[PDB]
From a paper:
HumAb 1B1 showed strong interactions with fHbp variant 2 (equilibrium binding dissociation constant, KD, 0.24 ± 0.03 nM), while no interactions with fHbp variants 1 or 3 were detected. Consequently, we sought to promote crystallization by first forming the complex of wild type fHbp variant 2 with Fab 1B1 (the monovalent Fab form of humAb 1B1), the structure of which had not been previously determined.Strongly diffracting crystals of the complex were obtained, and the structure was solved by the MR technique and refined at 2.4 Angstrom (Å) resolution, with the R‐factor and free R‐factor converging at 20.5% and 26.9%, respectively. The asymmetric unit contained three copies of the Fab‐antigen complex (hence, nine polypeptide chains in total) wherein all copies were essentially identical. The final refined models covered the entire Fab heavy and light chain sequences, and the fHbp variant 2 sequence from residue D76‐E261 (except loop residues 121–130, also previously unobserved in fHbp variant 1 structures, likely due to high flexibility of this loop 23 ). Intriguingly, no electron density was observed for fHbp variant 2 residues up to N75, suggesting this N‐terminal region was disordered in the crystal. The overall structure of the complex shows Fab 1B1 projecting all six complementarity determining regions (CDRs) onto a convex surface‐exposed region of the fHbp CTD β‐barrel, while the fHbp NTD does not contribute to the interaction. Thirteen fHbp CTD residues are directly involved in binding to Fab 1B1 via 14 hydrogen bonds and 2 salt‐bridges, while 6 fHbp residues make van der Waals' interactions with the Fab. In short, by in silico superposition of the fHbp structures of the variant 2/1B1 complex and the variant 1/hfH complex, 17 we observed that 1B1 and hfH could not compatibly bind to fHbp at the same time, due to steric hindrance. In particular, the CDR L2 of the 1B1 light chain would clash with the N‐terminal region of hfH domain 6. Four individual mutations resulted in a relatively large loss of affinity (KD values increased ≥10‐fold), indicating important roles in binding for residues F146, K179, Q180, and especially D175.
Residue numbers in the entry:
A (entry chain A): 75 to 119, 130 to 260
B (entry chain H): 2 to 133, 136 to 219
C (entry chain L): 1 to 214
The structure:
Amino acid sequence: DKVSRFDFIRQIEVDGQLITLESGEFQIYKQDHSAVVALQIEKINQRSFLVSGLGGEHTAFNQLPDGKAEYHGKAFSSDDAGGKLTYTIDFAAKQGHGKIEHLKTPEQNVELAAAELKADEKSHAVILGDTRYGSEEKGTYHLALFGDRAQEIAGSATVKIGEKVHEIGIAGKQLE
Amino acid sequence: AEVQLVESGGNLVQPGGSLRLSCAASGFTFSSYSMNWVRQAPGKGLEWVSYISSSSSTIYYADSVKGRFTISRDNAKNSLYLQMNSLRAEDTAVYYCARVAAGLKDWGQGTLVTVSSASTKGPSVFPLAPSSTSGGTAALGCLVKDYFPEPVTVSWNSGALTSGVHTFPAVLQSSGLYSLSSVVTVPSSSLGTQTYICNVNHKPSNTKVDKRVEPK
Amino acid sequence: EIVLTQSPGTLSLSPGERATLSCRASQSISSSYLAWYQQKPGQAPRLLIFGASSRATGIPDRFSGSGSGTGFTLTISRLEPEDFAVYYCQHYDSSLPMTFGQGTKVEIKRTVAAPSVFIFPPSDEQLKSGTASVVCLLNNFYPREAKVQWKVDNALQSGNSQESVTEQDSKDSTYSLSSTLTLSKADYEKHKVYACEVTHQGLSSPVTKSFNRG
């Protein structure tokens, strides 16, 4: 499993001169039942954006295993695919938590705060929580479960560093 | 489509007796969540009672009830139950149904269980007549004595008098009957012009008393 | 086994002030499984904090939790008036029977106020029943600590009296207490002077209200 990084431009042709309306980068990461995409668009003639994407074969909130699960995987932002995701979900207690470590920018290595495991509008198991650095809230994260045994998790997080919000992709698998 | 929990079944039972509580759930897929019984004796802290997981594969009981109580659930009827046996006096409490959802997030309103050999009995209501009255204010009241079981409601002048009213917590006496007072401070200049009546209502015995309280 | 001990028993703070409550575990516990609940008279408990530091859905931001190991903390940054209540911590690890701490009360601290004492002779009607209740009322005082002693013909009494107190008043944050001394019609006419002696922070010396008869 590798993170694929891409550069891209969207161009139009006007008077026989290709013109770039926007440019950017995106990283994609595939596991067995899920995929995540971060994406950064710049308008090359409200300026830059963070678009994320998340999808796969969602786990049904009414079909979760008993007990507890441990997950391990990757965290990635723009240039940085080195992050490491750790996460635990207690299914009996409808609760999850975890952390991000080893992104080159220290302030992106955030706790994924304890958060409730609930059902989304399609009755899929999901977790929405805060990101933390120290004891200060710094953003939110959105985690969905994937696979019929909830083998996988994937989603994304957001961190405010200075006055710029960063956006991190996160995906993991159960240890065995 | 909000979550709700409604306990029922609470009731009077003699020591050593038996009582089966219920809890009706709606607003969520009951069969997906762990549930708990928690109870509160009157004027005391919460005491966790029992736990049971979505599928009934894991059950816990507090040390205080291990033995006598049995938890179970029926997912088809979206209901949780608590069978109690060998009830003692110390089991007198409100019994709450609660849903595990990143903590005990949803609570029903509770069902009151009383465990006592005492027999139902309405109150005697005796006046606490205003006498001689520090400063400009007089105090008068009503002693509401030897009734069973709780609750008793007290109003003054059919509810027209609420300012200055202090209705005290019922204390359970060594006889097994409850007893409390209700008192009200009023301008002492009014004792000769205003009539004060405490209206006591004890639904369990269908007793109602309207006791005039005058200065004697 | 796990025992949860809260402290202090009562926290007396003014509105606006900062409140810090403590929960101590008898052994180390996972921070995932420490929760805080709020409770007000006549209401079901309400979940404030779950997972040691995460706020429950819809819970104002002034409630924060922290701690790890055996020591956990509930902080209320600025105490609004709807925040004066009883607070409980709870261990809810799904692999172990759960337990609640014994709870802490955050009451409203206000200016000292001495009680208006009143004494109430037993009603003639109650005497006919063969019993005599003597009632001492401590009205609208603060702080809640208060000591009432009964004396019949100078003789002190112990054992034959109950005490009861109201919740802090929602308009002036004072307490009221009643002490009731119970006797038979027989003992009550064995004596003449019925005295109620009241000690309180707001009183330079013990007051004594009393009456004569019976």
